[PDB]
């Protein structure tokens, strides 16, 4: 059975409270909650390292999910807990997971629009990551050409990136950039060989 | 499930001052920790962004070589462990190792995890009494202020405190006999007293410390020091001819003030957001100040919620992040080829049925922000080094009134 009071204290970031409720060990640390938390997703969530720390020594299992398809590491990759994201994957989290959203985004894609420690991090467990599409046949390269810069596009491009991909729509990168009105992106892909 | 409520932008140099964009953008939905920004507006207006808490300690010797101390607060709102560190450093620079008895009145407040969790995203303790606020700072002056000190915490302190040009003690110490609570009214002061005073960092400071948190603590004080809600409601009223529809608050932080049955959370309209960007702009720059001394830099702050907003944000944009059960939100400012332009998004979430959809939500408005910066030509970089905020700072050091 889970636990109500340890999973609000795991997301709240209150580890004296944890301490006080794991330790005495009536609870099952993988036990889901009705929507499929665990402790380690809350504390993942919450972006409470001391907390994720607490956890792995108690050998939780990682790769439980949500009923959004997410692990721990997805929830600290989405809610920009950069730290705890590096913990769990020096912690072997698997990395080829899929984060919540119509998209079916990678988690790679996901870090790579933000944070480029972890999303090297990921790329250093699966290098063929850098590829992987989405649901809708897109990879991190599209997300960077409408939203982000020229420096995102060569970090890509430097970690492997194929420019001639298309989407399910047929787009390629380059289309997207036009499309989302980023020149920067744009210019730079056009010229990309 | 994850939809947009409502958002809307304006240039800062716009002439005609007309807020752009949806249909709902007059219409209020949960603000979550946007509030903060409102609150910020708020205390600049009262206090000013280089206003000091000046905490007083009222000395006296005694005849064993030790002192009597009163401390006649200043309701600073970022006074815990590491404010009473520097406190416990300069008392030892002044040859203060034993104190007789400790006093303080109603205005001091201490609370240990001011800047830490769970104080950082949780309910701030709200005191009905002033016996039961008292009752708490004896017991935390007793068991924290007044204990060894945490050798990990004072070094990580005391290294970051030399990296903004202030001295701290190697070791340490004070040992404290007696504390009680005296209340301001009833407080005489010695003749043979010395008044000495310890002030804050400055307001701008302390809030670039709550706005890069996103600190319920801080906030919730600030907007309690203030009036609380019913001064609120007047502020605001006064300022933007603003009424209940436009804007209602219930405190500083934007947190949850009644239950997961009956929720309670701050709300105001899209537009309104845009006016209080407009208003605090306006307020710190009278001063020489622009939003990235009060408020989060993406990618530059990164001890801050926004430290991982990459892409054309980083380093263009300033802004507060928010996140409740039903709503997740981002409002700020965007550095453009174009110039400086305001925006607030206010998204609709269900994260009590999916907790899966603040990390949705999020990427949703940062892709928002990045199509409205993609609009205007792309980034500019704001001239900005990342801060280093400190409860206080070179001018705090113990000094005679």
């Given at each position: 059975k889970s636990s109500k009071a340890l999973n609000e204290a795991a997301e709240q970031g209150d580890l004296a409270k944890v301490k006080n409720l794991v330790q005495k060990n009536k609870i099952d640390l993988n036990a889901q909650d009705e929507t499929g938390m665990t402790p380690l997703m809350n504390a993942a969530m919450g972006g409470n390292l001391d907390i994720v720390k607490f956890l792995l020594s108690k050998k939780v299992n990682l790769e439980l999910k949500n009923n959004g398809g997410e692990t721990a590491l997805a929830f600290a990759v989405t809610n920009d807990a950069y730290d705890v994201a590096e913990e769990l994957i020096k912690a072997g989290a698997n990395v080829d997971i899929i984060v919540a959203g119509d998209e079916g985004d990678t988690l790679f894609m996901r870090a790579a629009q933000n944070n480029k420690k972890t999303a090297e991090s990921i790329l250093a467990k699966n290098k063929s990551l850098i590829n992987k599409a989405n649901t809708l046949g897109e990879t991190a390269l599209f997300a960077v050409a409408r939203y982000g810069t020229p420096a995102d596009i060569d970090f890509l491009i430097k970690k492997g990136?194929?420019?001639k991909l298309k989407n399910k729509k047929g787009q390629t990168a380059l289309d997207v950039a036009k499309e989302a009105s980023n020149q920067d992106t744009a210019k730079a892909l056009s010229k990309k060989k | 499930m994850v939809y947009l409520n409502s958002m809307c932008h304006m240039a800062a140099?716009?002439?005609?001052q007309q807020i752009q964009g949806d249909d709902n953008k007059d219409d209020k939905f949960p603000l979550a920790s946007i509030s903060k920004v409102v609150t910020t507006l708020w205390a600049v207006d009262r206090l000013g962004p280089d206003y000091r808490f000046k905490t007083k300690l009222h000395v006296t010797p005694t005849a064993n070589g030790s002192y009597d101390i009163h401390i006649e607060g200043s309701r600073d709102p970022l006074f815990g462990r590491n404010m009473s560190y520097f406190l416990i450093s300069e008392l030892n620079r002044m040859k203060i190792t034993k104190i007789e008895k400790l006093t303080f009145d109603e205005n001091f407040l201490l609370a240990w995890l001011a800047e830490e969790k769970p104080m950082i995203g949780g309910t701030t303790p709200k005191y009905d009494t002033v016996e039961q606020q008292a009752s708490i700072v004896r017991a935390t002056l007793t068991s924290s202020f007044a204990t060894a000190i945490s050798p990990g915490y004072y070094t990580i302190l005391k290294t970051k405190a030399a990296r903004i040009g202030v001295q701290m003690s190697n070791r340490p110490k004070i040992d404290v006999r007696t504390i009680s609570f005296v209340k301001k009214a009833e407080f005489q002061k010695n003749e043979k007293s010395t008044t000495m005073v310890l002030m804050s960092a400055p307001l701008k400071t302390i809030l670039k410390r709550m706005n890069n948190q996103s600190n319920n603590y801080i906030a919730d004080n600030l907007y309690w020091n203030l009036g609380g809600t019913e001064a609120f409601n007047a502020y605001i009223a006064g300022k933007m001819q603003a009424d209940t529809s436009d804007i209602e608050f219930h405190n500083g932080s934007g947190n949850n003030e009644g239950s997961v049955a009956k929720p309670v959370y701050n709300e105001a309209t899209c537009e309104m957001m845009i006016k209080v960007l407009y208003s605090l702009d306006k307020s710190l720059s009278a001063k020489g100040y622009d939003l990235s001394d009060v408020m989060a830099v993406a990618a530059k702050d990164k001890a801050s919620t926004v430290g991982s907003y990459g892409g054309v944000m980083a380093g263009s944009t300033t802004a507060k992040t928010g996140s409740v059960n039903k709503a997740k939100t981002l409002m700020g400012s965007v550095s453009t080829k174009n110039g400086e332009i305001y925006f607030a998004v206010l998204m609709h979430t269900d994260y009590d049925k999916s907790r899966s959809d603040w990390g949705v939500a999020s990427q949703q408005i940062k892709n928002k922000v990045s199509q409205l910066i993609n609009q205007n030509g792309g980034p500019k970089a704001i001239k900005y080094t990342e801060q280093l905020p400190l409860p206080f700072d070179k001018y705090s050091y113990l000094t005679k009134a």
């Open positions: 990136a194929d420019l | 140099n716009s002439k005609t």
